[PDB]
Design a protein around this ligand. Structure first.
Ligand SMILES: O=C(N[C@H](Cc1c[nH]c2ccccc12)C(=O)O)c1nc(Cl)c2ccccc2c1O
Ligand SMILES: [Zn+2]
Ligand SMILES: [Zn+2]
Length: 220
């Protein structure tokens, strides 16, 4: 609706989604990310799409949860996922991404997470990272995109590889692999068959049906 606002809400015990709005090429869009508690610390999944928005997110997190963000992971190299990494670093947060994501961000002119994730090289690879599992499903919205599962809550965060139910277009496919995308969605289906909440990269949370909806949109 209005640009530059940031909110959080509860998904499960120790799991929240953050939502922010931003202006892009003459239009305003919402965008989602995740927050996961690990003891008395927080793990952040993806920026809030810009420096100003990311600084507001840290202030909302401090007022509403009150535990420190110590680590952050960006799930691909575009600005809605890394824009704000420099604010996070100045706040003392350790920032991470795959090596391919870090190289692509630099090619693009974007902010670059400091540390490289290990073990995510081929389609189907998965690694534990504190309270979440990180999965590379294959190329989809981009060749580097990751998805994130929370075993304690049975929640799947699909990022920009998963479209909301209300979407009719795949959007910016400049870096997409439309030929591979359906296969990558099937890999998620088969790896996390039991997930009961699926959070897309933009729009309302849904169920596993979002994976088949995504396939349908991307095919057309
Ligand atoms: O075309 C989009 N959306 C329309 C409208 C829509 C339905 N449901 C939505 C839920 C959220 C945002 C837009 C919608 C759709 O698919 O019919 C679209 N959406 C987003 Cl996010 C984009 C983000 C970044 C760059 C381009 C984008 C984009 O083109
Ligand atoms: Zn993107
Ligand atoms: Zn996106």
């Amino acid at each position: 609706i209005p640009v530059g606002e940031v909110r959080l809400y509860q998904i499960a015990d120790g799991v929240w989604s953050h939502i922010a709005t931003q202006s892009f090429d003459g239009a305003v869009y919402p965008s989602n990310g995740l927050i996961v508690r690990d003891g008395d610390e927080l793990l952040l999944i993806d920026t809030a799409w810009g420096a100003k928005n990311t600084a507001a997110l840290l202030a909302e997190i401090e007022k509403q949860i009150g535990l420190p963000v110590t680590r952050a992971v960006s799930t691909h190299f575009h600005d809605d996922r890394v824009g704000g990494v420099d604010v996070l670093r100045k706040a003392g947060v350790a920032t991470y991404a795959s090596p391919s994501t870090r190289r692509l961000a630099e090619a693009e002119g974007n902010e670059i997470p400091t540390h490289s994730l290990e073990g995510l090289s081929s389609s189907g690879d998965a690694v534990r990272f504190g309270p979440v599992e990180l999965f590379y499903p294959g190329a989809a919205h981009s060749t580097d995109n990751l998805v994130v599962y929370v075993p304690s809550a049975n929640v799947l965060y699909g990022g920009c590889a998963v479209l909301a139910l209300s979407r009719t277009s795949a959007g910016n496919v400049a870096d997409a692999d439309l030929a591979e995308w359906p296969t990558s969605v099937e890999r998620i289906q088969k790896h996390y068959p039991e997930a009961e909440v699926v959070i897309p990269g933009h729009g309302l949370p849904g169920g596993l049906d979002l994976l088949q909806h995504t396939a349908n949109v991307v095919t057309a």
